[model samples]
Target: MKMSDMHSSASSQEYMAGMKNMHEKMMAAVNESNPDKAFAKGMIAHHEGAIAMAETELKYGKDPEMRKLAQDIIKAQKGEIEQMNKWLDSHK
Candidate 1:
């Protein structure tokens, strides 16, 4: 389901507030000095934030299309996370 479809006004407000906080934190942690490592780590954090939102959709959403979207988000983000993990591992 679209977020608008899934959330009542109150929950949507709450969820958006929470997501904003998470995004803020992710942005605050971003750095450019390390170049490759910094971008990899920052993007992992960003992807993780998206995964978290996707999970929220799964928990409260009822639409099959949205559920599939959430699943796809998890799948793709986790894949990127895995690649970043390997990149970090090898770089370190």
Candidate 2:
């Protein structure tokens, strides 16, 4: 999180907007059966939206390295989503 992190081109404006929208949703009350699970569930949507955003980059980006990283993010976020769901299941 630095000034450079905000540095963007016209192409990234939509992505920034997408992320801002995602953040707003993540900020809302996603109250589950309990508080911790509620937080995780909220984050699950956040990560899912971010995964989609990363995929959006794939549609526009040509960089092989960043593309690979985006693939990695999708995989990792999916795994995390599963883990959080499991926590919700077991804890409830």
Name the TM-score of candidate 2. 0.67
Off by over 4 Å in 2: 1-17, 30-35
- Per-residue alpha-carbon lDDT of model 1 for 1-92, expressed as tens digits? 58767646754765686578667766765755787887888888888878878887887789999899999999999999999989989986
lDDT of 2: 0.81
Best by TM-score: 1
RMSD per prediction, one decimal? Answer: 5.2, 5.5
Candidate 1 lDDT for residue 45: 81
lDDT of each prediction vs. the true structure?
0.81, 0.81
Cα TM-score per model: 0.72, 0.67
